Amino acid sequence: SDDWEIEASEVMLSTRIGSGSFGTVYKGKWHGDVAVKILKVVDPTPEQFQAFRNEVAVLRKTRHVNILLFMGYMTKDNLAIVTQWCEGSSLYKHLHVQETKFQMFQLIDIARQTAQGMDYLHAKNIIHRDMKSNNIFLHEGLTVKIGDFGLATVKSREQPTGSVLWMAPEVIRMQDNNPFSFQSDVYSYGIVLYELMTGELPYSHINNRDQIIFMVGRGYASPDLSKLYKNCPKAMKRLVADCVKKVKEERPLFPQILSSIELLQHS
Amino acid sequence: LEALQKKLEELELDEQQRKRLEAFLTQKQKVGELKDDDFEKISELGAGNGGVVFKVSHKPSGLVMARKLIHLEIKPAIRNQIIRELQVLHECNSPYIVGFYGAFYSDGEISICMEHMDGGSLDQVLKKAGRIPEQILGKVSIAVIKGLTYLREKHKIMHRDVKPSNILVNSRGEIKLCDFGVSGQLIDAMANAFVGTRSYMSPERLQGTHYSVQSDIWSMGLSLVEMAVGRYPIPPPDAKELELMFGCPMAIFELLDYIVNEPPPKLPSGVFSLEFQDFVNKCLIKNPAERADLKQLMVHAFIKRSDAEEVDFAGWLCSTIG
Ligand SMILES: CNS(=O)(=O)Nc1nccc(Cc2c(C)c3ccc(Oc4ncccn4)cc3oc2=O)c1F
Ligand SMILES: CCCS(=O)(=O)Nc1ccc(F)c(C(=O)c2c[nH]c3ncc(Cl)cc23)c1F
């Protein structure tokens, strides 16, 4: 194939980390610790084989310290992608399971690094299409790594896993054939910003996914910004609101988001 | 143990039902606290509906069970509270409610172990039967109407998710409800962790206004139509598709928007009885106050007809799946 295909006898699968509907993530060993995402597909069609090598080609173009390091793929026995192993947990687990006590300067740093990675992807014409705090990993706690981008080619193939909490209204309504854009990614980044600056998920008082889908698509519901931390800088509060705006064209792009954070960081 | 049997005698059972309920409670006493190591996998009985479900054998007892794996990332306090709130299912013993054995948390998944049903869900039954005969949809209606009133009187609970895949059936002709909202923390957890392709949600619940068991009646009516014809009805059938099922897709938001704005679906006239049509029309009233409630449904003409009709449900089921 190309020189990033990995032979299966070289990889030793260890423990099971996560398991969605589109695949399963194992910790493994391949010249040190590694992560293997194995796709739940036993009869991969010539069509799905091509979409996989296409999404692998996109993964092949990313080399950045805030993007999860692609390392190789497997296409014979099964469809899988091998990446670096992050020693910390995902940002979701930090904020919503362990409830780790980040300080304000660390929340801004996570925000800035995430924006740094997203800026890189868009500069390479990559749209994440599914950004949440589940997909942001803290390698050893200090540096964020963005993953679970790509394979939107293969994901589009009753009640599966996934979430609506990070979906832009234009993406929820799905009225265009392609509602995904740099600003739909900005909205998702905005919701991650909300998580960072409140400690909890949006729409915490609504417990009905179908209510959330309807209410957010109509404009009757939006993240409650009154729950932002009191120590949250007032410029950061503006940035949450700017990224979360209902209008797709009113949202900042990541060069501006970066600058907003960088000038804030100059205390 | 016998506190469970005292609550059996507070119900209006017949001779064959008390036999089976008493036999299930004695099997509940064979099993203790459940764990992942205690189970041997047999087959797979489902993939959607909020988690994979396996047919399994509990080694110490020998019992066959259904094990629902619900994957959720939640802080340990919520895990323990979800298992605490699920223990009310030990006290949910009714002919119209599937049984409970125990619940526990392992790996990153809440395991719920419950009564096995060899007939499967009416969702699974429908895709083999094409459409469900009306005589049987009468018997199914009774089971649902009775299970909802059992929950509201003996437990003060709503189902919150009445759909074809949450009605299960037995080779013994039993029709029971499952996957109802016992744990408030589990309700919150599964809204954030899953996505939906279709909806049986009442328009008042979609809009955030006050709701009651009337929302479940709306869901029953929407499920009955979907089982009568062989298709989800939110996008009403084409003038062609109707003439392709009896002879002589929208995204989730567009569905939810349709359920709120456009008139409710109806049973196609001429192929079904008039009372059954009036029955679903009384279930699919948008305004909940003028929608039929549970007592009116039990005295509606369609139910008194169906309750008297002796049907071989168990027979039809084993004929259409095997
Ligand atoms: C779509 N409606 S919603 O209100 O938004 N969400 C929910 N609706 C219902 C329910 C829930 C959550 C929930 C689920 C999914 C469940 C599944 C199996 C189960 O086991 C069992 N065993 C024996 C007998 C009957 N059940 C118990 C269960 O209790 C719950 O609270 C919603 F999250
Ligand atoms: C270069 C990105 C490849 S991806 O976009 O397909 N995503 C992907 C592929 C394979 C994976 F294993 C993962 C993944 O979930 C993790 C990668 N490294 C990790 N470290 C810790 C945890 Cl909990 C999870 C992961 C992952 F996000």
Residue numbers in the entry:
A (entry chain A): 339 to 495, 503 to 612
B (entry chain B): 30 to 277, 307 to 380
Reproduce the article's own wording on this structure.
We cocrystallized the CRAF:MEK complex with PLX4720, a type I.5 inhibitor that is a close analog of vemurafenib. Crystallization was facilitated by inclusion of CH5126766, a MEK inhibitor that is known to stabilize RAF:MEK complexes. The complex crystallized in space group P6522 with two essentially identical copies of a CRAF2MEK2 heterotetramer in the asymmetric unit (RMSD = 0.715 Å). We refined the structure to an R value of 23.02% (Rfree = 0.2639) using data extending to a resolution of 2.91 Å. The structure reveals clear electron density for both PLX4720 and CH5126766. In this structure, CRAF forms a back-to-back dimer, with MEK1 bound to each CRAF KD in a face-to-face orientation as previously seen in active-state BRAF and CRAF complexes with MEK1. Unlike prior structures of CRAF2MEK2 heterotetramers, only one CRAF protomer adopts an active, αC-helix-in conformation. In the other protomer, PLX4720 binds an inactive, αC-helix-out conformation that is essentially the same as that observed with binding of related type 1.5 inhibitors to BRAF. In the opposite protomer, however, it exhibits a noncanonical binding mode in which the pyrrolopyridine scaffold is flipped and the compound adopts a compact C-shaped conformation such that the propylsulfonamide packs below and adjacent to the pyridine ring, forming hydrogen bonds with both the active site lysine (K375) and the main chain amide of D486 in the DFG motif. This altered pose is sterically compatible with the active, αC-in conformation of CRAF.
